[PDB]
Design a protein around this ligand. Structure first.
Ligand code: SF4
Length: 178
């Protein structure tokens, strides 16, 4: 809800796919369509207004030396239209629009190859036990469960107490705790 708290929320309440998108956006001051879509709708879902969204996406896109006016002429329409599509679910994310080079959207558990997923989780300081467990699930295609496991670890609880199927559900479940 607070535009200047997104950096921290990334760390605690965003599932790995949205945390990645927020990261990629802050470092590259830009995201391709796949991710503007996934992360954009997700931010809407967590309750950002249309005013904050434009100020969020415009502000970051300008840090990339992008002509402020070019932004309104080539981006802002879709932000605004978004606020009058449905936030992506895990299956939609897992099953559609497979990320390519330069893309950062998708499901980390389903789209990152095993070794890169490992490194990523290691950068999030997940225990070596937890990382091993996730690698077992992922090999079995139990993506959403690996994500629940990740949820349980960064929250320090034994059972998330919910069957995951939506990035926004993860953020909610998360917020109910912290
Ligand atoms: S499992 Fe669902 S939420 Fe967890 S990352 Fe993959 S997509 Fe995002």
């Amino acid at each position: 809800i607070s535009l200047d708290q997104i950096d921290l929320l990334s760390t605690k309440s965003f599932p790995p796919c949205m945390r990645q998108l927020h990261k990629a956006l802050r470092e590259n001051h830009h995201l391709r369509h796949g991710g503007r879509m996934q992360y954009g709708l997700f931010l809407k879902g967590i309750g950002l207004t249309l005013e904050q969204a434009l100020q969020f996406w415009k502000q970051e896109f300008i840090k990339g030396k992008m002509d402020p006016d070019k932004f309104d002429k080539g981006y802002s329409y879709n932000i605004r239209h978004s606020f009058g599509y449905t936030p992506f679910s895990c299956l939609k994310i897992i099953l559609s629009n497979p990320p390519s080079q330069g893309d950062y959207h998708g499901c980390p558990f389903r789209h990152s190859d095993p070794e890169l997923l490992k490194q990523k989780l290691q950068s999030y300081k997940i225990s070596p036990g937890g990382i091993s467990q996730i690698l077992d699930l992922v090999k079995g295609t139990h993506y959403q469960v690996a994500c629940q496991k990740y949820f349980e670890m960064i929250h320090n609880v034994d059972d998330c107490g919910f069957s995951l199927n939506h990035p926004n559900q993860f953020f909610c479940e998360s917020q109910r705790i912290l």
